[PDB]
Amino acid sequence: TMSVLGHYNNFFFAAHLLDIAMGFKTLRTILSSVTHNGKQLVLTVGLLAVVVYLYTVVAFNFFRKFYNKSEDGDTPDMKCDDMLTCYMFHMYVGVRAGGGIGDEIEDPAGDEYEIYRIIFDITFFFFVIVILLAIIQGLIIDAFG
Amino acid sequence: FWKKIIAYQQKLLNYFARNFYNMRMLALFVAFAINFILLFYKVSTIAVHYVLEESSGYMEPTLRILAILHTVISFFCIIGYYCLKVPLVIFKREKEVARKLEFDGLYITEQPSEDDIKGQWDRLVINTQSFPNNYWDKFVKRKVMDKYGEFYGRDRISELLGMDKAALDFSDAREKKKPKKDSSLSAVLNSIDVKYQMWKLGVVFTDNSFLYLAWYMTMSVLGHYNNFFFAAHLLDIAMGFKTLRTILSSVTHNGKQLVLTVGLLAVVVYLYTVVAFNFFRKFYNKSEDGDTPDMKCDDMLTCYMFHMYVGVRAGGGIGDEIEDPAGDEYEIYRIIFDITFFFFVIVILLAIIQGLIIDAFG
Amino acid sequence: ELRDQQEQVKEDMETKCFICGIGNDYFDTVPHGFETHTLQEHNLANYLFFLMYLINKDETEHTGQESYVWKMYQERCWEFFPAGDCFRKQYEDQLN
Amino acid sequence: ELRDQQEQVKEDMETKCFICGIGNDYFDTVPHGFETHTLQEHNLANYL
Amino acid sequence: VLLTNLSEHMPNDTRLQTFLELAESVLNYFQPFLGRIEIMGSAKRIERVYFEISESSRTQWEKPQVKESKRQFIFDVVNEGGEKEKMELFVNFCEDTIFEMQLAAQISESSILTVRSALFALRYNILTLMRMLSLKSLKKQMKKVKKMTVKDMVTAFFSSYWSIFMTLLHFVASVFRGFFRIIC
Numbered sequence: 094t095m096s097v098l099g100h101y102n103n104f105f106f107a108a109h110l111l112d113i114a115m116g117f118k119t120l121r122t123i124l125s126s127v128t129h130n131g132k133q134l135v136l137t138v139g140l141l142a143v144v145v146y147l148y149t150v151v152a153f154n155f156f157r158k159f160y161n162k163s164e165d166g167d168t169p170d171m172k173c174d175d176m177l178t179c180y181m182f183h184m185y186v187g188v189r190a191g192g193g194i195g196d197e198i199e200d201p202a203g204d205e206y207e208i209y210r211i212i213f214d215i216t217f218f219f220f221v222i223v224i225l226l227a228i229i230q231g232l233i234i235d236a237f238g
Numbered sequence: 239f240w241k242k243i244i245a246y247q248q249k250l251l252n253y254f255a256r257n258f259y260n261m262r263m264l265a266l267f268v269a270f271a272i273n274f275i276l277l278f279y280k281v282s283t284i285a286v287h288y289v290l291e292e293s294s295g296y297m298e299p300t301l302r303i304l305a306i307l308h309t310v311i312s313f314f315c316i317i318g319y320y321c322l323k324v325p326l327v328i329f330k331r332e333k334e335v336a337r338k339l340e341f342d343g344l345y346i347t348e349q350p351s352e353d354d355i356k357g358q359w360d361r362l363v364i365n366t367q368s369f370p371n372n373y374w375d376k377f378v379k380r381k382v383m384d385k386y387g388e389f390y391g392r393d394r395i396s397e398l399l400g401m402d403k404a405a406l407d408f409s410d411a412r413e414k415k416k417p418k419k420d421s422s423l424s425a426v427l428n429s430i431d432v433k434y435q436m437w438k439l440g441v442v443f444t445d446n447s448f449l450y451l452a453w454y455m456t457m458s459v460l461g462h463y464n465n466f467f468f469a470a471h472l473l474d475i476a477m478g479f480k481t482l483r484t485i486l487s488s489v490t491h492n493g494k495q496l497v498l499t500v501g502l503l504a505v506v507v508y509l510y511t512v513v514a515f516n517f518f519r520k521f522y523n524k525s526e527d528g529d530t531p532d533m534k535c536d537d538m539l540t541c542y543m544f545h546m547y548v549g550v551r552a553g554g555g556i557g558d559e560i561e562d563p564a565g566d567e568y569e570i571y572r573i574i575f576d577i578t579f580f581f582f583v584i585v586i587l588l589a590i591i592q593g594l595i596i597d598a599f600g
Numbered sequence: 601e602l603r604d605q606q607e608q609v610k611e612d613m614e615t616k617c618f619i620c621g622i623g624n625d626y627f628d629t630v631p632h633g634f635e636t637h638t639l640q641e642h643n644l645a646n647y648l649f650f651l652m653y654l655i656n657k658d659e660t661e662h663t664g665q666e667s668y669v670w671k672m673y674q675e676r677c678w679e680f681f682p683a684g685d686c687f688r689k690q691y692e693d694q695l696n
Numbered sequence: 697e698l699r700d701q702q703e704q705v706k707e708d709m710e711t712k713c714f715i716c717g718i719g720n721d722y723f724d725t726v727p728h729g730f731e732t733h734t735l736q737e738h739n740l741a742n743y744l
Numbered sequence: 745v746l747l748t749n750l751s752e753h754m755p756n757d758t759r760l761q762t763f764l765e766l767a768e769s770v771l772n773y774f775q776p777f778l779g780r781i782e783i784m785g786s787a788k789r790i791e792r793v794y795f796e797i798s799e800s801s802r803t804q805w806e807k808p809q810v811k812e813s814k815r816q817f818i819f820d821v822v823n824e825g826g827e828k829e830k831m832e833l834f835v836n837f838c839e840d841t842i843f844e845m846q847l848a849a850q851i852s853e854s855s856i857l858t859v860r861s862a863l864f865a866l867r868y869n870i871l872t873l874m875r876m877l878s879l880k881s882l883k884k885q886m887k888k889v890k891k892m893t894v895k896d897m898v899t900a901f902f903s904s905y906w907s908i909f910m911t912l913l914h915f916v917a918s919v920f921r922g923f924f925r926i927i928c
């Protein structure tokens with residue numbers, strides 16, 4: 094089906110380049126590593142989702158005012174006004190921030206919730222970045238090993 | 239009539255004990271549904287009126303019904319746990335207290351260590367008339383009497399254990415008894431013991447699972463006041479699944495060394511903060527505009543803030559967010575400072591905490 | 601590896617005794633056999649107490665075994681110490 | 697694994713001799729039994 | 745010591761055990777002082793040795809200056825102790841411990857409130873639970889519900905357990921108040 098669809102659109106032929114993984118034993122091991130521990134992997138992804146949801150709820154209830162992401166001052170980009178968009182802003186771009194959600198959020202210095210913000214972002218950095226991501230990583234690499 | 243209260247009460251208790259597990263499952267599903275309903279929540283623009291935006295238009299009545307149903311199902315889970323697992327814990331503790339009473343003489347030959355809440359609490363159950371209520375024979379009292387009474391003293395050992403030798407002789411002698419009446423409430427009140435109910439409810443409160451279920455209780459009733467407290471019930475999935483249980487217990491398993499490593503990280507960050515406070519203050523300006531400065535390391539409390547928060551999370555050491563030290567007379571000292579921070583704080587002790595946790599899990 | 605070495609040392613104590621090195625498996629046939637072998641049969645504290653008893657006792661009053669051990673100790677000969685053996689192993693055929 | 701193989705080789709020397717492969721446990725009954733078995737009884741240098 | 749020697753070299757003979765039961769108290773008293781080791785005999789047989797252990801030497805043994813030193817000695821010998829180095833190091837440590845215990849003898853010269861507030865909270869709260877039975881207000885509800893109504897019965901039972909949960913909350917609050925009083 095991939096070949097006959099590649100006749101219609103030549104870019105479908107790129108899917109056939111996945112056949113190298115079938116061809117070589119090492120690539121077969123790498124691809125099967127995901128499925129081997131994939132059950133615990135799905136559970137860990139769910140736990141990460143749970144933790145990100147809890148942090149999103151906390152920021153929604155208390156830390157909305159910091160979630161402006163608009164460079165210009167005339168129009169605001171109010172990210173955590175809707176919890177769906179706030180859960181977006183956490184899942185996408187806070188897990189990938191590399192130093193917690195505190196990097197892209199505006200600086201909490203001088204606010205009356207300063208210490209609460211610091212604890213929030215530090216606990217996010219630990220539980221989400223340092224923890225559960227190393228857990229997924231180690232699960233996959235240990236299945237391969 | 240009283241036959242019928244007893245019958246229907248026992249029927250309800252047996253039903254709840256039989257269905258306690260599936261009913262915890264239904265409570266978890268109700269919590270998940272409530273959280274999914276809350277997913278579509280919204281703020282409206284000064285009192286900020288939190289209004290639940292509804293795509294279909296039927297979310298808020300369903301949320302109300304599911305909140306009430308969650309409370310009811312969780313309360314009945316309390317009932318089911320009390321009917322099912324509480325008597326087993328009571329029987330186990332009764333067995334332990336009877337065995338240390340007889341074989342070891344924990345309260346006759348010796349005394350409780352006085353640092354053990356278990357022993358201090360079980361001191362009360364000894365004199366209760368409902369002793370082994372659930373532990374088979376009620377003759378362990380007589381056995382301890384025979385074993386230790388004559389050695390230490392019959393009268394006051396009988397006072398301690400709760401019997402008298404008059405009843406012991408009356409056991410062998412002729413006896414006349416008046417059977418109890420279910421109609422008489424005072425008879426049941428005399429039958430139930432204040433000290434035994436004391437001990438039983440204290441043990442039940444000491445039980446950890448009952449404490450978890452009471453936490454679930456309080457979270458639900460507070461979720462009625464504020465619907466967002468229902469999100470705490472979504473932590474029950476970790477209790478539900480074994481793998482999540484392992485993940486949550488991984489923190490506690492190596493948590494002692496983990497606390498020590500966190501303290502060592504604190505010590506190292508404090509030393510670096512002191513060094514930067516004494517020497518490297520001039521670089522700690524974090525104000526983009528030049529008119530007003532944001533002088534972070536002027537106060538060491540704020541400087542320790544600026545290290546702990548945002549230097550450990552910098553990903554490349556405190557040198558990333560600090561201004562560039564090029565051209566300063568302390569240039570090499572600054573370079574060594576930031577490189578050693580990157581190694582000891584980022585590369586080291588953070589990999590150590592990470593490895594400790596993941597290795598506990600493994 | 602430092603953690604592993606510490607745990608290795610601890611479980612080596614738990615498995616085998618220091619004096620003669622016989623593992624706990626042999627003593628485990630009888631209840632608390634290894635524990636007994638540690639506190640009375642093969643006790644580091646007991647051996648040190650014997651050493652101080654030899655030092656504090658007069659040369660005239662030494663018994664036969666005491667004088668034998670004292671002579672071997674002075675000459676720095678450690679053969680009197682059991683090596684992979686004990687009273688239980690030595691008299692297993694009669695005792696058990 | 698390279699480090700582990702090097703340590704494996706070293707401790708295999710320490711446990712057993714090359715010529716006949718009998719582990720040190722048998723020789724260990726007498727003092728320095730394995731050492732003696734290595735330098736005079738079974739010595740690679742002596743065989744060469 | 746003589747009785748112990750006879751008993752250990754002859755466990756079978758019952759008369760010796762009879763003497764042992766006759767002398768249990770003496771042996772029990774002398775057990776801490778009695779020393780027992782196994783040595784390689786001069787006649788190629790393992791022989792048990794019995795000796796006296798002084799109480800002062802024992803006390804010096806439980807003193808921590810012994811304890812840290814023997815921690816270190818065990819940790820060293822288990823790791824880097826050879827077949828023969830193990831035993832020579834044991835003897836050397838024995839002599840060093842002898843010296844340091846002599847030094848120790850020379851230098852030597854010659855939650856309650858938590859349990860108890862918890863008891864108060866539990867007694868108070870359970871007594872408040874039974875204050876309803878003391879007021880005796882269940883007999884009137886009884887007389888109203890002489891008739892047969894499972895709905896009223898389940899409501900009444902749920903109310904009683906409802907207040908048992910309320911009682912649990914009062915207990916938690918009392919524990920929290922006690923904790924505050926102690927921390928302040």
Ligand SMILES: Nc1ncnc2c1ncn2[C@@H]1O[C@H](COP(=O)(O)OP(=O)(O)OP(=O)(O)O)[C@@H](O)[C@H]1O
Pocket residue numbers: 613614616617618619634635638639642643644811818
């Ligand atoms: N030869 C032995 N001599 C003494 N203890 C031994 C011996 N072999 C094994 N053990 C074990 O070692 C423990 C006692 O010895 P050791 O003093 O090293 O340990 P410990 O529990 O830390 O003691 P302490 O609390 O007195 O410091 C016991 O668990 C005992 O079973």
Ligand SMILES: Nc1ncnc2c1ncn2[C@@H]1O[C@H](COP(=O)(O)OP(=O)(O)OP(=O)(O)O)[C@@H](O)[C@H]1O
Pocket residue numbers: 709710712713714715730731734735738739740
């Ligand atoms: N069959 C054997 N022949 C020689 N040495 C052996 C043998 N079996 C074990 N060994 C051990 O190997 C060591 C000596 O052999 P080898 O030359 O391999 O090691 P080494 O200590 O690096 O020697 P050198 O210092 O001479 O280079 C000793 O520790 C010895 O106990």
Ligand SMILES: O=c1[nH]c(=O)c2nc[nH]c2[nH]1
Pocket residue numbers: 374
């Ligand atoms: O020795 C006994 N132990 C028990 O637990 C028991 N239960 C009933 N009858 C019993 N007898």
Ligand SMILES: [Ca+2]
Pocket residue numbers: 660661
């Ligand atoms: Ca003589």
Ligand SMILES: [Zn+2]
Pocket residue numbers: 617618619620621622637642685686
């Ligand atoms: Zn031994």
Ligand SMILES: [Zn+2]
Pocket residue numbers: 713714715716717718733738
């Ligand atoms: Zn050989």
